[PDB]
Amino acid sequence: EIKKLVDQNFKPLLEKYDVPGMAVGVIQNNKKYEMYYGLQSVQDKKAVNSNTIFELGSVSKLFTATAGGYAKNKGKISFDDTPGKYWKELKNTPIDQVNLLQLATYTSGNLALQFPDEVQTDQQVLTFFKDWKPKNPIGEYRQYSNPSIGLFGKVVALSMNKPFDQVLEKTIFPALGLKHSYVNVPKTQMQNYAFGYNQENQPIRVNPGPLDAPAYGVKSTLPDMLSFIHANLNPQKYPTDIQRAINETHQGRYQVNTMYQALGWEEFSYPATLQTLLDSNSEQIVMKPNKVTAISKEPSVKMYHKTGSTSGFGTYVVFIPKENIGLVMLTNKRIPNEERIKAAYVVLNAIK
Numbered sequence: 001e002i003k004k005l006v007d008q009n010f011k012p013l014l015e016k017y018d019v020p021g022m023a024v025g026v027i028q029n030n031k032k033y034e035m036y037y038g039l040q041s042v043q044d045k046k047a048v049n050s051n052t053i054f055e056l057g058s059v060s061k062l063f064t065a066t067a068g069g070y071a072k073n074k075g076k077i078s079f080d081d082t083p084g085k086y087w088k089e090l091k092n093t094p095i096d097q098v099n100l101l102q103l104a105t106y107t108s109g110n111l112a113l114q115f116p117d118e119v120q121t122d123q124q125v126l127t128f129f130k131d132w133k134p135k136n137p138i139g140e141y142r143q144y145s146n147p148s149i150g151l152f153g154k155v156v157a158l159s160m161n162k163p164f165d166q167v168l169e170k171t172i173f174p175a176l177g178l179k180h181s182y183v184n185v186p187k188t189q190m191q192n193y194a195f196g197y198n199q200e201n202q203p204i205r206v207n208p209g210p211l212d213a214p215a216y217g218v219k220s221t222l223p224d225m226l227s228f229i230h231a232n233l234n235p236q237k238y239p240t241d242i243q244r245a246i247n248e249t250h251q252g253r254y255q256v257n258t259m260y261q262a263l264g265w266e267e268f269s270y271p272a273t274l275q276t277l278l279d280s281n282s283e284q285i286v287m288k289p290n291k292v293t294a295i296s297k298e299p300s301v302k303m304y305h306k307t308g309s310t311s312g313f314g315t316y317v318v319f320i321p322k323e324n325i326g327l328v329m330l331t332n333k334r335i336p337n338e339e340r341i342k343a344a345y346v347v348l349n350a351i352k
């Protein structure tokens with residue numbers, strides 16, 4: 001029945017949005033299911049398979065959040081610290097009045113989704129943070145942002161003395177059991193890297209950008225993402241450092257109505273209505289700043305999700321610890337976040 005449920009709910013989306021290829025993974029009671037559809041490459045007629053590498057987009061934030069949780073539990077950082085304590089060069093500039101938790105969770109009060117296009121170099125990055133100056137009451141307003149978690153990410157790599165790409169590929173990925181997850185796809189794996197397809201069905205991949213690795217720059221396979229979901233459902237089986245990191249990412253920090261923000265993960269009381277899952281990615285929540293309130297109801301039974309996108313790829317990831325289930329969907333064309341969320345909802349709810 002798992003296979004038949006995904007065929008009912010995910011398969012039609014390939015035709016509906018002319019998506020070349022898709023990989024849907026389900027984990028239940030420590031049993032993994034992998035469903036593959038279509039092509040990693042239209043021009044090569046190479047099929048999507050277990051070796052196919054997709055761009056995760058903002059699901060990369062979950063790895064950046066896990067890397068921070070690890071660094072905090074090795075004593076390398078505190079989430080009450082300010083960025084200037086590690087990147088000396090910002091060390092009494094006004095960015096050093098925002099703390100790492102506030103960076104991680106988007107409540108600087110003045111960071112947008114993107115850098116400005118003009119910024120590209122390492123010096124242009126450091127200079128934009130040297131010249132960063134306040135706006136909304138720090139800590140009070142959530143606005144989703146690549147530079148913010150991007151800065152948290154870089155600060156985490158500074159506290160670990162290793163550039164960010166190495167923190168993941170030598171430290172975090174091996175600790176999670178991930179064999180084919182990369183910030184940079186090496187030469188021997190380029191044959192498995194899918195093409196993404198833009199809205200003109202042109203084959204494309206992700207463009208270089210400032211602090212792209214920590215905010216949207218991880219590439220993985222379906223087996224690997226199911227391993228990552230496994231880890232989130234069962235952190236007690238992993239090494240102490242990574243287990244503590246994973247638990248750290250599950251703690252709700254504030255609410256923005258029915259969405260609780262954690263470290264990368266969005267958190268909900270379970271069971272959640274569909275529409276509660278949809279509003280987490282409504283334009284209001286994703287693009288416009290919003291004022292945060294303190295957690296009032298600590299949810300008893302929780303569920304977590306995150307969407308991601310580069311211009312050629314779509315990702316969605318969801319897990320419910322207490323039902324011991326989760327789902328990952330990866331596509332090499334963006335479909336609307338709404339459609340990702342709904343199909344997953346029907347598949348998981350139908351398997352109890």
Ligand SMILES: *[B@]([O])([C][N]S(=O)(=O)C1=[C]N=C(C2=NN=N[N]2)[C]=[C]1)OP([O])([O])=O
Binds near residue numbers: 114286312
């Ligand atoms: B993340 O995926 C952030 N997404 S984004 O909208 O900032 C974005 C989109 N596209 C790129 C890109 N394509 N090719 N080079 N770069 C980067 C960043 O969260 P979401 O799921 O989008 O809410």
